[PDB]
Every structure is written in C-alpha cells, then in structure tokens.
C-alpha cells in the first residue's frame, strides 16, 4: 500500500523533501530528514494509534522509559536542523527527539520515548515547532508586556527595570541590591522565564558586584548612566569574576571617547553590543563597526528591522519626541541626523544576511516592540531573499540555510550570549521544554500554543463557554501553566552563581525554578551559530557609507512587508 505525498502531508505533516511556505513570505523550508517508520506514525484520537496495547504501552510505569508528554509529527525548525520528529518531554525537559510509541508492536521506537499510562499527547502534525524565543533586551516597564511577548513566541525575558520609572524607561537596569530583590519577588508572578541586569556603572568594584551577589544575572552599561571608560572597565572586571554577561549601549555623544576608546576600555573582554546598528544608541555614526570584532556578541533591536519606506520618518520623530528635542534647535537636529541614518540601517539588513550581526532582540517599550522580535526576523530574511537572491549556500530550491541562520538569531545565540544555553534556546535533548507550535499560515506572526516547562502557558483559543474550544472569539489567552503554583514549576529565574551559592532564593522565598548563568566569559563571535563572521567594517564618517571587504553595503527600503496587513486588526 502506498499513499500519495499530498495526502500523506495532510494526514501526518510533511516528510523528507517536502517544502512549506513560512506565513505569506517567499521563504520555503524543506524537510531534511524524518525519524518516523512509515506506517507506524504516532497519532491520537478516536480509533487512532496511541491506544492501550497498540501505540500506547500498557505495562510500564512512568519511571520506566515512559514520557510525560509526546508531541507527535513535529516539523522542527532549529539551528540544529529542519526535520520531522516526535518530541518527548519528561520532568519538564526535552528527553527524546525521535520516534514515540510502543516497542511491543512498532518498529523504530526511540527507547526512552514510550507512550504509556503517564503520557499526555499534543498533535504537532501540520505544525512547525521551534524553541521559545530568547529576548535579551527587555525593559521591565509594564507587566502587560509579558502576554505581548508570549503571543509572538518569546519564552525568556532578559533585561531590567522596576516599572515605569525613568531609569527603567531608558535603561535595561534594576539598580542595587534592594531593587533587584524586589524584582526577583515580582518575577514570581510573571509567566515567562526572567533574568535581571544590574547597573553596570561605578568606579569602585563593590557597588557593582553587590548587585551580582544580590541576584542579578548580568549587567547593563548605558550611556544614560555614563558609558565612560571607567564604568565599562569595572563592569567587565566584575563580569569576568562573576561569570555573567555585560550588555552595552555606548556613548553616542562621543563625550569621553570615540568607538576606539570604548574598544580600548573593553580590552578584548567579551561583551554583548545592543542595537549595534546605532539608531537605538551608540557612538555616532560608527558603532556598528563593533560587529566585526571577535570579542563582541552583536544584536539588533527590532524597529530598524527591516529597512522600510516609513522607517526613517518614524525614527527621526520617535527620537525627537523621546528626548524632548526641538526642531528649531540646530544641535538637536544635528544629533538626530547623526543618529538616524539610512546608510547604516540598509547595511544592517545585509549584515544580518551575511551572519555578521548574530542576534535579534526587542528593546521592549524603550525603543522596540515586545511582540515583534520573531516577526521582524522573518520579514528581514524575506526582504533579503527578494533583494539578494537565495544564498549561495542553499541546496537548490529551499531557503533552509537562511532559515537556520535567522532562527538562530532569536533562539540559540542570545541564550549562548547570556550563559543560559545549557537550559534554553534550542530543541535539543536535555534542555528545558520551552516549545512554540505554529500553524504555517501564521508562522512568526501569532503562536498557536506556547509550552513552558512542559505545560501549555499560552494559546490562541476560542469561546470558553462553547461546546468545543475553536468557536469565536479566538484570541491569545493564559493557560493552566500560568495558574496557581504551576507558574513556579514552568518558569526559570536565571541568577548569578554567587547569589545562588549565597542562598538568595531561600532568603527571598523564591519558588520558581532557579537557573544558573555560566560560561559567559570564554565565548566570542565564533560561538554564534550560523552567524560567526568577523571582518573589518568601515563606516565613512562623512557619508555614513558602510563597507565590508571593499564593497559598499546598500539596499533599498521596501514599501510593503509580508506578515503585516493580511494578519493584524490594527
């Protein structure tokens, strides 16, 4: 008996060689391999395979190679591959990627992926499954930002802030031991993973270090607190001792130095350069040259992503509004013109496509959109395909190389930068079960279901009074993973090694899972998956033209994007 491929794909999701369109983009991903045994696919329902004595084993207790949860027939999109597999989860972690079911009667069952009495099932046939997004540039300004992030598939928020205080509205900073303690306690009620950044400012070590000991997971150097050579130096000395990451928003004003002075202060130490293109902040006009260096982990923030016809007008005015700048003060106009540059924004598109900028992030509520990191990553990839063509690395027909390069920017790379990739950032055995299911038609736009620690936390679902869950209105809603004490077991608070050793979680009564930040100081650009390119980036101080390998990097802004007015009510 044979099944035609159209009918197979409709029933079980796609298999090897089949392609799927990402939303309404021109991007096609192709199934590279498939772990199934044809005829023994797992599925659940009336008269289906996962029934006792059949695809469900009726013999084994939970400890005996049985799963807590099986996602059947997933199309995985990850830095590790684009492929078809069942995903097995146990104790909140991914324990198996392969083929689930019952070894009694099925061929090819992965030995620790037994469906048993203890096993829940999520049908992933016809869905794309990715890791949860890791947003490393979050300003904690308004708690309503969490659902916004979850709805676009983000599952970890790294950053700082105490709410809508000016320090926090400007900088990803929770300053000092007391504010840090308060925000660790607030975090107990946020249905998302969290890590908190302290203020990377001071000329003595102790005031900076005591934040790490209090429970910060990293530091932010920000020009609004003085991004001076001294603050840069002390923060990196702390970070090297503490094994945490430092993010920087550099001295746009060039007040205490130019880019080369900031690099001298860094002195070859590892650093995460936020909004590296510079519209979001940094040494005018040449900050983006940071992304060429081996010790720099470079990210973009999302409003420049990608370069469109409204980008400049929007940014010039956004900047003037936010800094209370006046159009009739020439220094204000000069500042704005030095900071918002089509030459560097256009080059930023291309640097992403080339693997020179390694990460995406939001800048949520400060100069960026909490629910558009994933969205804008794919809009960028689509624009680059249209303007630059398939990458040379592609094996005819598919966009798999580009898809792996771009998915890495908001999943594994930010996790590696922050020292948390042992726990999150990819679909790999041994990592926390933060997983996002997407219908291909909504891919990158609106998540179907967001799984946190192996329990659904957020879902697009309908009328709670209806006979079935699909009648209108279908909207994003918090699910049982967020309710009661389950919010503690399905989310991680990431903290410094020292705060954990000093018993801060017990002192504060933290009940969430505690994650350790580690292996942040011994990495570089080379460790950024699919985005590991170092090169000399030249930014002309007169024209702002960007050159790499002797060639000007330029492209046009687009008038329309996919993943836009077809989907959104406003």
Nearer to Ni ion, 249 or 525 (CB): 249
Nearest approach, Cβ of residue 171 and ligand OH (Å): 8
Question: What's the CA gap between 473 and 155, in Å, rounded?
Answer: 24
Residue 286 touches which member of ligand OH, its own copies, other proteins, none, C-beta under 5-8 Å by kind? other proteins
Task: Provide the minimum distance between the beta carbon of 236 and other proteins in the complex, in angstroms, as a whole number.
Answer: 14
What is the DSSP code string of 231-275? HHHHHHHHHHHHT-EEEEE--TT-SS--HHHHHHHHTT--EEESS
What residue has token string 């790294």?
A: 158
The answer to whether residue 323 is catalytic is yes
Identity of the residue, 363 or 423, whose beta carbon is nearer to ligand OH in the bound complex: 363
Does the annotation list 137 as a binding residue?
yes
Near other proteins by CB under 8 A: residue from 463, 532, 538, 545: 463
Binding status of residue 11 toward other proteins by CB under 8 A:
yes
Question: Is 139 within any annotated ligand binding site?
Answer: yes
Residue 49: name its binding partner from ligand OH, its own copies, other proteins, none (Cβ under 5 to 8 Å by kind).
other proteins
- Give the torsion through C-alpha atoms of 15, 16, 19, 22, to 10 deg: 70
Cis status of the peptide bond prior to 61, with omega within 30 of 0: no
Residue 309 touching other proteins (CB under 8 A): yes
Q: At closest approach, how far in Å is the CB of 8 from other proteins?
A: 5
**What contacts 543, CB < 8 A, 6 or more positions away?**
343
Q: Is 220 annotated as a binding residue?
A: yes
Least distance (Å) between residue 65 CB and its own copies:
12
d(CA 17, CA 286): 44
324 is in an annotated binding site: no
Question: What six digits make up the tokens of 403?
Answer: 């898809």
Give the interface with Ni ion as residue ranges (CB under 5 A).
Answer: 249, 281, 363, 366
**CA–CA separation, 402 and 29 (whole Å):** 9
Instruction: Record the tokens describing residue 324, joined without a space.
Output: 């209370």
523 binds other proteins (CB under 8 A): no
Q: Which is nearer to Ni ion, 290 or 435 (CB)?
A: 290
- Nearest partner of 100 among 125, 77, 69, judged by Cα: 69
74 is in an annotated binding site: no
Question: In the set 58, 143, 189, 268, which binds other proteins (CB under 8 A)?
Answer: 58
Hunting for tokens 């329309």 — which residue is that? 560
Under the criterion CB under 8 A, does residue 106 sit at the interface with other proteins? yes
- Closest approach, Cβ 516 to other proteins, in A, equals 31
Residue ranges that bind ligand OH, judged by CB under 6 A? 249, 274-275, 280-281, 301, 363, 366-367
* Residue 566 found at the interface with other proteins (CB under 8 A): yes
Residue 40, SS3 per DSSP: coil
Q: Give the active site residue among 201, 323, 352, 488.
A: 323
**Cα(96)–Cα(132) distance, integer angstroms:** 17
Which stretch in 226-234, 290-298, 496-504, 511-519 sits in contact with other proteins by CB under 8 A?
A: 226-234
Backbone angles phi, psi at 208, to 5 degrees: -80, -50
Whether 275 has a binding-site annotation, put simply, is: yes
Determine the interface stretch with other proteins among 81-89, 140-148, 178-186, 269-277 (rule: CB under 8 A): 140-148
Q: Are 438 and 374 in contact (CB under 8 A)?
A: no
For 243-257, give one letter per residue: b (16+ CB within 10 A) or e. bbbbbbbbbbebebb
Annotated binding site for Ni(2+): 137, 139, 220, 249, 275, 363
Q: Which residues are annotated as a binding site for substrate?
A: 139, 170, 222, 249, 366
Sequence ranges of the binding site: 137, 139, 170, 220, 222, 249, 275, 363, 366
Question: Active-site residues: which are they?
Answer: 323
């Amino acid at each position: 008996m044979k099944i035609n491929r159209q009918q197979y794909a409709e029933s079980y999701g796609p298999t090897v060689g089949d392609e799927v369109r990402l939303a309404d983009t021109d991007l096609w991903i192709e199934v590279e391999k498939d772990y199934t045994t044809y005829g023994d696919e797992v599925n659940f329902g009336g008269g289906k395979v996962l029934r006792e004595g059949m695809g469900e084993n009726g013999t084994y207790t939970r400890t005996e190679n049985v799963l807590d949860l099986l996602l059947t027939n997933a199309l995985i999109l990850d830095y590790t591959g684009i492929y078809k597999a069942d995903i097995g989860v146990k104790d909140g972690y991914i324990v198996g990627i392969g083929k689930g079911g019952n070894p009694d009667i099925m061929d090819g069952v992965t030995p620790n992926m037994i469906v048993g009495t203890a096993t829940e099932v999520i049908a992933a046939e016809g869905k794309i499954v990715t890791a949860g997004g890791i947003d490393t540039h979050v300003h904690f300004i308004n708690p309503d930002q969490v659902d916004v992030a979850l709805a676009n598939g983000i599952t970890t928020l790294f950053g700082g802030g105490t709410g809508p205080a000016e320090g926090s509205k400007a900088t990803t900073v929770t300053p000092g031991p007391w504010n840090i303690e308060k925000m660790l306690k607030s975090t107990e009620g946020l249905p998302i993973n969290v890590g908190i950044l302290g203020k990377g400012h001071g000329s003595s070590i102790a005031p900076i270090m005591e934040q790490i000991d209090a429970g910060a997971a990293g530091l932010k150097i920000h020009e609004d607190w003085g991004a001076t050579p001294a603050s840069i130096d002390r923060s990196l000395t702390v970070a090297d001792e503490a094994d945490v990451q430092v993010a920087i928003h550099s001295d746009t004003l060039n007040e205490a130095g130019f880019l080369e002075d900031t690099l001298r202060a860094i002195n070859g130490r590892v650093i995460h350069s936020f909004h590296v293109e510079g519209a979001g902040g940094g040494h005018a006009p040449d900050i983006m040259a940071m992304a060429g260096h081996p010790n720099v982990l470079p990210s973009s923030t999302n409003p420049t992503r990608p370069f469109t016809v409204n980008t400049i007008d929007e940014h010039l005015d956004m900047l003037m509004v936010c800094h209370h700048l006046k159009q009739n003060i020439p220094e204000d106009v000069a500042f704005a013109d030095s900071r918002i540059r089509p030459e560097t924004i256009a080059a930023e598109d291309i640097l992403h496509d080339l693997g020179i900028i390694s990460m995406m992030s939001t800048d949520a509520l400060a100069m960026g959109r909490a629910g558009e990191m994933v969205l804008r990553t794919w809009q960028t990839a689509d624009k680059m395909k249209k303007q630059r063509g398939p990458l040379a690395e592609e094996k005819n027909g598919s966009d798999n190389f580009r898809l792996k390069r771009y998915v890495s920017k908001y999943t594994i790379n930010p996790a590696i930068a922050q020292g948390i990739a042992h726990e999150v950032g990819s679909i790999e055995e041994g990592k926390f079960a933060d997983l996002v299911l997407w219908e291909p038609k909504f891919f990158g736009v609106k998540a179907d279901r967001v799984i946190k620690g192996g329990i659904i936390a957020y879902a697009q679902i309908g009328d709670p009074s209806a006979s079935i869950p699909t009648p209108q209105p279908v909207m994003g809603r918090r699910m049982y993973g967020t309710v009661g004490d389950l919010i503690h077991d399905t989310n991680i608070t990431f903290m410094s090694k020292s705060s954990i050793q000093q018993g801060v979680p017990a002192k504060l009564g933290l009940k969430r899972r505690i994650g350790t930040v580690k292996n942040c100081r011994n990495i570089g650009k080379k460790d950024m998956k699919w985005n590991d390119v170092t090169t000399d980036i030249d930014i002309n101080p007169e024209t702002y033209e960007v050159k790499v390998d002797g060639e000007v990097l330029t492209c046009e802004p687009v008038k329309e994007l996919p993943m836009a007015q077809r989907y959104f009510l406003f």
